[PDB]
Design a protein around this ligand. Sequence first.
Ligand SMILES: Nc1ncnc2c1ncn2[C@@H]1O[C@@H]2COP(=O)(O)O[C@H]3[C@@H](O)[C@H](n4cnc5c(N)ncnc54)O[C@@H]3COP(=O)(O)O[C@H]2[C@H]1O
Ligand SMILES: Nc1ncnc2c1ncn2[C@@H]1O[C@@H]2COP(=O)(O)O[C@H]3[C@@H](O)[C@H](n4cnc5c(N)ncnc54)O[C@@H]3COP(=O)(O)O[C@H]2[C@H]1O
Lengths: 150, 150
Amino acid sequence: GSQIAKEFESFLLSHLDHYLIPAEDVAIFVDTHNADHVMLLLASNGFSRVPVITKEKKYVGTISISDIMAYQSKGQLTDWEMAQTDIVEMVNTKIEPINEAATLTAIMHKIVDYPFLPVISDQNDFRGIITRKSILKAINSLLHDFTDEY
Amino acid sequence: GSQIAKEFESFLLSHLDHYLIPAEDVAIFVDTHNADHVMLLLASNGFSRVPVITKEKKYVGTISISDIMAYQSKGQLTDWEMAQTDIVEMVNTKIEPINEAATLTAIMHKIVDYPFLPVISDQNDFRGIITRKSILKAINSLLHDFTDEY
Ligand SMILES: Nc1ncnc2c1ncn2[C@@H]1O[C@@H]2COP(=O)(O)O[C@H]3[C@@H](O)[C@H](n4cnc5c(N)ncnc54)O[C@@H]3COP(=O)(O)O[C@H]2[C@H]1O
Ligand SMILES: Nc1ncnc2c1ncn2[C@@H]1O[C@@H]2COP(=O)(O)O[C@H]3[C@@H](O)[C@H](n4cnc5c(N)ncnc54)O[C@@H]3COP(=O)(O)O[C@H]2[C@H]1O
């Protein structure tokens, strides 16, 4: 009864960096890379959607193969033309990044609509991502601790 | 302290049907439908991956636009040829469906690797799906109840 409630206080008031997949371990795209090779790398990494950053590691947005395809068809561009265009042009900006100072309660409410959230500093530096898998793993470790009592 | 632990017992020992998105509300494909229109409907529903069922509502597998594209390129098939082929040929069978009698602990451990799980009966009837969003919403309602005390 007692130890159960405090484990939740220590969970709810815990830091965001406990659940973060650091920027080094996040497959990203530099906004100046060509679109044809991005379509190629996305087929090799296997991720449906990845973050887009600048050379200074500043957050721009996210990209998927769908985004690249929508741009090519909307602009009627050829395959060769795409290999001469950078990602900036077709970058998705719909996902609003979360600050690294964000509460875990604030994470819980946002991660219900997003498979992942990109994490930024106050100066728009890319810090990594919060995935639903990371949060789900944290919930499972917590439940693992309450099955110890009864 | 007291009311906290029982809410978790009632959560952990709860039925799967509390978190299920019933079969009626799941966008599916009938295994005999043409592949070209499936590529079309997948662009209208917006789901990255959906279940594939038979006319008798028996579970077959799942489909995505990637699966359709991989089949067309691997078989070198033309656009018109795809409109004359049914989904059965390119159906993904990697996701193992969960029984409707499955424990919520068993759900927790499986939903960490899968955005969704297709739910089946003992006779392979499709019952619906368990999404990560459904589980994440259930965790949030639970945390909402413990913030009431302190
Ligand atoms: N290489 C792999 N090995 C093992 N399991 C894999 C995997 N690729 C995908 N999955 C599984 O599929 C889920 C959805 O993947 P998706 O690529 O659509 O969606 C992913 C992707 O868009 C992004 N993501 C995850 N890890 C990433 C990373 N290290 N770098 C860049 N983006 C990442 O976050 C979304 C949600 O991720 P999450 O981990 O919660 O959930 C992942 C994970 O459970
Ligand atoms: N039309 C829409 N309206 C609002 N939010 C939307 C949406 N489409 C996608 N999302 C959001 O994106 C998440 C990942 O979507 P995705 O299409 O890749 O992946 C989905 C899709 O493959 C499947 N799914 C969810 N609901 C479905 C349904 N009613 N019929 C068929 N498949 C469904 O389960 C996966 C995980 O679903 P989940 O709900 O946890 O997570 C969803 C949801 O949070």
